Amino acid sequence: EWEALEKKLAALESKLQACEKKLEALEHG
Amino acid sequence: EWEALEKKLAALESKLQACEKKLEALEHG
Amino acid sequence: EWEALEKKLAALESKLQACEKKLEALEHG
Numbered sequence: 001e002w003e004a005l006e007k008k009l010a011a012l013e014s015k016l017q018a019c020e021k022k023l024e025a026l027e028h029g
Numbered sequence: 030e031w032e033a034l035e036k037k038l039a040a041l042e043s044k045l046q047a048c049e050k051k052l053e054a055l056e057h058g
Numbered sequence: 059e060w061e062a063l064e065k066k067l068a069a070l071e072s073k074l075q076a077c078e079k080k081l082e083a084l085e086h087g
């Protein structure tokens with residue numbers, strides 16, 4: 001459970017970065 | 030602290046999910 | 059490590075709040 005939490009937190013971080021990038025490129029183009 | 034943090038991770042995950050759904054909507058108008 | 063996990067969760071939540079505020083500005087002008 002400790003390590004499953006840690007991996008969820010890593011995926012959240014990666015997902016959020018992917019959002020941040022979509023968010024940016026919708027802002028542009 | 031454990032289930033508090035788990036609850037806090039669950040809330041972020043669904044807020045992020047909302048964000049990704051609203052970004053995709055914005056994408057299509 | 060617990061305190062490191064919590065700081066990472068705090069930072070994720072700040073970036074999410076920031077992505078949410080940017081998304082509202084894009085939705086609504």
Ligand SMILES: [Zn+2]
Pocket residue numbers: 001035
């Ligand atoms: Zn659990």
Ligand SMILES: [Zn+2]
Pocket residue numbers: 031032035
């Ligand atoms: Zn639990």
Ligand SMILES: [Zn+2]
Pocket residue numbers: 053056
């Ligand atoms: Zn799409």
Ligand SMILES: [Zn+2]
Pocket residue numbers: 053057
């Ligand atoms: Zn789509």
Ligand SMILES: [Zn+2]
Pocket residue numbers: 051081082085
């Ligand atoms: Zn909105």
Ligand SMILES: [Zn+2]
Pocket residue numbers: 085086087
């Ligand atoms: Zn509007």
